[PDB]
Design a protein around this ligand. Sequence first.
Ligand SMILES: [Mg+2]
Ligand SMILES: [Mg+2]
Lengths: 249, 240, 196, 236, 243, 243, 245, 231, 111
Amino acid sequence: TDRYSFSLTTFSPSGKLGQIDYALTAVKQGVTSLGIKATNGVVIATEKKSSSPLAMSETLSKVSLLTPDIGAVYSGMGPDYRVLVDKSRKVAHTSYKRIYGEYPPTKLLVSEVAKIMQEATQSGGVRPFGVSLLIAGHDEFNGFSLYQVDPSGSYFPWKATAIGKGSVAAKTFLEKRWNDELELEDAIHIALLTLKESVEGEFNGDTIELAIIGDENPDLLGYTGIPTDKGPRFRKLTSQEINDRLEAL
Amino acid sequence: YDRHITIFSPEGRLYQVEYAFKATNQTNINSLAVRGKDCTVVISQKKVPDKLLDPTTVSYIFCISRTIGMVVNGPIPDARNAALRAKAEAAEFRYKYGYDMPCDVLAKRMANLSQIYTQRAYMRPLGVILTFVSVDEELGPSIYKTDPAGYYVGYKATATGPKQQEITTNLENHFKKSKIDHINEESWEKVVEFAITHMIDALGTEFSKNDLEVGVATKDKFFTLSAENIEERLVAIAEQ
Amino acid sequence: MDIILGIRVQDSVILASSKAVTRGISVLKDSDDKTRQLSPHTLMSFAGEAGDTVQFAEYIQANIQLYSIREDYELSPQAVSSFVRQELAKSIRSRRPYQVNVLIGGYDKKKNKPELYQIDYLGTKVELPYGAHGYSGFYTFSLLDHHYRPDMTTEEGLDLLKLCVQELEKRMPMDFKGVIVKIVDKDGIRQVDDFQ
Amino acid sequence: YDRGVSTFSPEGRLFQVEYSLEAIKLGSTAIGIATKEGVVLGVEKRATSPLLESDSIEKIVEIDRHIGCAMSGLTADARSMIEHARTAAVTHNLYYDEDINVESLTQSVCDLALRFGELMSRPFGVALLIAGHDADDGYQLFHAEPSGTFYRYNAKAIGSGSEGAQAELLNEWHSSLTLKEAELLVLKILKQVMEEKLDENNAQLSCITKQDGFKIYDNEKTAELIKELKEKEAAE
Amino acid sequence: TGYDLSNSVFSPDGRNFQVEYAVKAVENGTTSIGIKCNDGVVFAVEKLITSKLLVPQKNVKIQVVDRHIGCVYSGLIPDGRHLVNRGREEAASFKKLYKTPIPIPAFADRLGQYVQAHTLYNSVRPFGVSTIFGGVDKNGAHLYMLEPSGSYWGYKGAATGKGRQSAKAELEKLVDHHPEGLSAREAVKQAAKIIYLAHEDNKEKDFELEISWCSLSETNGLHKFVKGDLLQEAIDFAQKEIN
Amino acid sequence: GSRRYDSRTTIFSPEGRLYQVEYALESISHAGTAIGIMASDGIVLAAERKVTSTLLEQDTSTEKLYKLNDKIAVAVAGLTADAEILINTARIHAQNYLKTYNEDIPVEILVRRLSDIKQGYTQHGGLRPFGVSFIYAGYDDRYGYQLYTSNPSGNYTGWKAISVGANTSAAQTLLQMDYKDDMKVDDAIELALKTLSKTTDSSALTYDRLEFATIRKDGEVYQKIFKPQEIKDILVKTGITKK
Amino acid sequence: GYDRALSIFSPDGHIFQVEYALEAVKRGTCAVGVKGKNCVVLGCERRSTLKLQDTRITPSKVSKIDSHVVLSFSGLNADSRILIEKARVEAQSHRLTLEDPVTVEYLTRYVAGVQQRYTQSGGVRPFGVSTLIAGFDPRDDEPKLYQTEPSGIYSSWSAQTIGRNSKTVREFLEKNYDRKEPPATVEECVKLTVRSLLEVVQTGAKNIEITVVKPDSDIVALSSEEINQYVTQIEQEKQEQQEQD
Amino acid sequence: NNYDGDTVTFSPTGRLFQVEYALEAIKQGSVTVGLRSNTHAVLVALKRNADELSSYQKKIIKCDEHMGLSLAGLAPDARVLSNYLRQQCNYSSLVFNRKLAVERAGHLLCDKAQKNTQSYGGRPYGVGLLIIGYDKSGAHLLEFQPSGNVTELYGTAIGARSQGAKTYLERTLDTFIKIDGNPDELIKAGVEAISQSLRDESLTVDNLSIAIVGKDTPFTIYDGEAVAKYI
Amino acid sequence: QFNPYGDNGGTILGIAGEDFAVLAGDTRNITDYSINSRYEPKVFDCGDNIVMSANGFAADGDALVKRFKNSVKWYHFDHNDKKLSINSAARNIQHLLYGKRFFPYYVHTII
Ligand SMILES: [Mg+2]
Ligand SMILES: [Mg+2]
């Protein structure tokens, strides 16, 4: 019987919410991830830190698809991110698609997952989520967008940013490399360069995970015959594409 | 009291998860799992110290479904708890979606439940590590492992226990020499022999037919070997 | 059934309600007032099934009085009519729906305008220069359609009301024992003492 | 706060009940005396300021025509209790076409006392004197505590000054007391234990008689009785 | 510090100290044993006579589940009654759904899952009993022992209580000397002997022996208490065997 | 049980204060200052962003000023997520009032509802209060233009000019010093900008750290949320900055 | 779900949460009620800490429960909002089922019952509010004034004060209120109330708020101008008294 | 020590201190004894008053025409448990046309008391019970403790100074067990037992309560003048 | 289609004297045109010198009489073995009957 009906996150006399701060600490101790918004697409990237050499890293995906036009990456506790991506996928249907027949815009799905995490910082008998999320999406009326969502439930739109360990160095690197005329390939190159500083071991298509929100891929749709139905704008790059772009890194 | 319930420490850690991890090793038994061409083998140490025990009832390998088998590294109460839950989840999956629950999907479900225990204060984590194996009809031989932190992943091979590291290194070396992600054997008998041999090497100890539990998963069936099956595997090994 | 009439003239709203209450073959009462004052400038008349009428009317009255006390302000007649209509529209799909039809006459002091609303038990509301509930309309709607004029005075409206009541007393089968008449204008709600 | 509100002490007592008894010890004085001519209930109103209208201090209430109640302690806590009593009485009547027994009403009231925990959050902070008459056991006076226990007393004093008042009652009570004697005795003990000079405004009398039921004395009758007691003490 | 104050809390070692304290409560109790024979099981228990005001042969300790399961427990007796009530509910449910009486391993796992669930929350206390139970099903005889942690195993012989150690010693002797297995009556005699032997730790107080058995041939697969002539025969065997 | 871990978020201090309300107010005291000024012909809201970075997308950014309906807007000080929860509830309540009465909701009714929601968390439920303070700027046909404020205690108050968040003492003193009852909306814009520039803990009051909004008056009112370029222009117009 | 016992007993017999609610009441602005011969007057202190308050829209310290009964308070404002809403709902319900407005004693008793309920229920804290409830019973001309406490205690008062510095105002009232000659006119009662507030209200004008209740639902709030006239009259009499010897 | 804050906490030795505090609440209650032969069962209770102006609190409660009990400790808990026992006997009679066996009544009381000792928020009962009954298997005397332990005996005693009565019954066993068909003699044996627990007090008609049940004798209570014969 | 009621016939008769009362009933229990029993009593002693009969549907009558006996038992329990007066019994039986006002006992009751 759940007798934890009271808040586990309370204000300290200094004004801090301790559990949110500690979740942020856990996020800072997580592996670096980043996102860069170009003019014709967005890119999100992170490092695949495997637990064992016997473990098959391809089974575990750090970059997840939320909707055909919205993907997500994280920094922090993996399982929290996994339940969060499940909840986000389901809420994209229950709270929007089943009502309007179209997928939600990036800002509204970000607001839904932020509401989930906010309730996690205030409901009874629960701890905040120990993750920070980067959501990259495209919708018809807002275009391409990149959002950061923190354990407290706050979110911010970004031209480019990074989270996790080494986040301040990556943010400084991005501030000096980002302009408002960047093509998607330029953003991919800048993302590879920024991630290289965060890794010390192998840096190849098998050790880093990278996805984009770009043009519609009709070959990825699976059916033909509806002209209004284009392919998804989300595409996860393959090890081969990553290595190809690493040749000229 | 940040050490009593599943809330963050100032360092951002969940000490109850770490202590459950510590509890998983309480039984002092080691297990490992490897994949053949068309099979998946798990072997676990069987230690029956009390002579009054019925040795047939001493097992940490569970038949979750017709295709999925699970070996647990942890105390038997939490082990049987997780086993019952996994069996129920697999049966319900089959009833609802019309096909057998895959290994990785059941692993994800159990890891989600473990994560729920990691975030809700009123339920403690299970002090167990669950290794699920099968021959998936889409993925082939599969090994997936879950832990009290809600983590899960797939494996070429894996080991769990106090001396796990030793075993792991052994297996790593072998794959670094074989350059393939499985055991190049067509018969599950030879894969069982491989598993027992490499565990003997990594642990530096010999085993009788009463020192082992073996679970084999082939296309459309998971089963466990008996004392005699293990014994003739050991005979074939000794003839090397 | 019961006679429920309302006429919106240039400067007031006049409500006329039959005075009889009848069960079976007995006229139990002949001095029954079928209205509740919802607010100092809003009056509601009602007709329908026994019990449901007064119950719904006094419920609406209590709610409007609570709002007035809470906000120290009088809701416009349009707001009161919308609240009543929404209550009735929720009623029809409930376990036991309210079987009550109402007329709402108000003086919008912010608009300085008389307003009359006819709302049936289904939650159907309209704003009309003249309205009626029950069989009464079948006789009066034509009468007024001929004689009503938008610039009429309160006395002219009372004369038209007298014409309607005379026609109802001539042609309607039942004896509704006369009508009580009330006027709602910028100065509130008063009752005409004798219409006969 | 460090332990459950239903925790036993090492001595075998419920902490919250003992603390409620401590709270009751601080309440105003209330005295009941039972005689073969009826029961008398008196209370010290104890107005907390001269501007307080002592008429609104209602520490004597009617449960039913044949049952009255006096309170001592956190008197607000008594309110719901009184309700549960009144209801109970009339309800019995509705089901049985008769008056409820005094002891049955007292047991019904006491059945609420320990219904707290984690249910109300705490025991009641008020004790009650329940005076009444029924055709089975005549006139009766009961003392009901927030422990669930109720006793029957020939005389009983509760509230601040209960020890000395109870000793006085033990010395003065006999089985052949008349009603007026009990009235004067209540008045005398109250005047002794009160910090203020007892008059007809800071003290209240009431009685349960078989013929007239439960009657709360008006201030004029109580004042005349006070003058009678003054004259009795003067001539002794 | 304070890791032992709340149930279901992990200590830095990975222990649940409240379960171990319940185990202490169990060890404080009287001795109860079970012995698996060739076609059934035997249960025995020692009952201290605190005073001769106690009515002999009354105050029965062994409980029956369904018609084929016997249960005895050492520790907090009311906790054992609670566990037996839950087990009876489980067996009734199983029979109502599946027609057949509940197999002994199935019933064992029912009890075990219940006891384990009683270690998952801080709002409940672990069971202060160790339970020896079992009986005969379609697969033969089964004897089980269940610990306050929810752990349980199948045994050739089992024992708990203050005299559990000498009982386990005698049971290991019996197991080594009879690889073929004991008969039901021989198992009853040996249970009487082991109870009388383990009573020496409570030597200052008199004890009453209580035995039950479920044998495929001697009781036709049903649980029956050993009383009358057979009980006196076992008592005499133990008496002349302690000398 | 779980009573050991209850923070008891709805209790009184010995001095008669609510611990969590006070600590939430302390938390809000570190949030970027928000100012509301009501003139005779409009209302002005001006808030300072604390989330400041060059790579931040300020076009699609909104952390201070939110629309409740077409007549009411709010400036937030504190945890933006609790604020968005309360803002969604407020929007739903405004639409409920509209559907029920076919009239736009009066400002004070919405403010009182939100404040009652806040108060509920300070008296029951054992939950933490919302770490949010609102400045409401609204217009209705009963009181014209209106400014209110609400805080974690659930207390709401009406003002001619007011500030929430950091450095409210200095801002309120400056507003008292320079506010006139007859001043117009543009004068209010200037006063709010000057107060923010004089109280800001940053080097200078640049446009990228500001959110701005005006509710003006046709018998219809207009809500304008200033875009970054409009904020830059109004900054050079006031003289806070030079182009 | 949440049912933790917050208001419990202490070893000395105290319920500390109710007493801390009384402290919250003590830290609130002062409120005064004075009974006349044919009226009741409720005065209230307004905090002077901030000048930019919008007086048309800021919630007033005096609230109408019904057309004939008024409630003022001292303590936390939001708890008072809760109490006032409950009381207005109960007033309308009583009108609906009894076909008669509430007596002042009845409304006071209901408010006191709610306040007491919040001191014996799990998961809730007591109200940090004390109230003065004034008015006239239906078809009655005798003035009625009552006071309710966070504990649930309620009583009737010829004149009473609550809030900060209430002891001073109560001393003043006890020295100046003659029960044999209560204020004969509305002017006398309002002047006595304004004097009571002047005993503690330092600024005076615009810090005092006055409401007058007269039989048959005659409730009117005095604007700051009449209040300032009263203040000027009192001050002039004071200056005379200061140098008329 | 640190493990008596609730019933849901074991001590390092394995004790439930709240249950022991309830047992102490019993030990301070007034003494009562029970004893049975082969044809009757008798309860003898010493009632306790507040002062000389008060009554003597009842200690014997009737549950059914064939079963009753005496209390020692918290009277409200005894009332609750006796009401539950009444309901169980009533259910047995109504559904099965069957007098409830005293042994099954003891089992029901044990299981009722147990659930308060394993769950948070609750508390154990603070009263001990002596249950006399006559069923299809003869006379029965039970002792119930709030730990849940219920025990059938020929006789026993609970409350303050109960050890004297208990030892007297242990000695008198062979004699009083044979008092068949003579109720007054078993009542005299019971009052002789309860006299051993007297300290600076003597049995009077105001403070003595007796109850009897048995073959052709419904559960009946003697109070006041009725017990004057046995003083 | 299932009818929850039946008719078992029978006839009862009560007469009140000066210092006595009498309550008689036929002992025949029938169903349709067949006889169920020639001696099935339906006039019962309920204690406290109260005799009761509920004639009509046998199941409903037996249920009502059982409930009244139980009410007498609990009245003795809750009020110190107070004798239940005939008027108190009558009011208690009125409440028992009206409890099933919208699913009645098909019985005519006489005490
Ligand atoms: Mg899942
Ligand atoms: Mg947890």
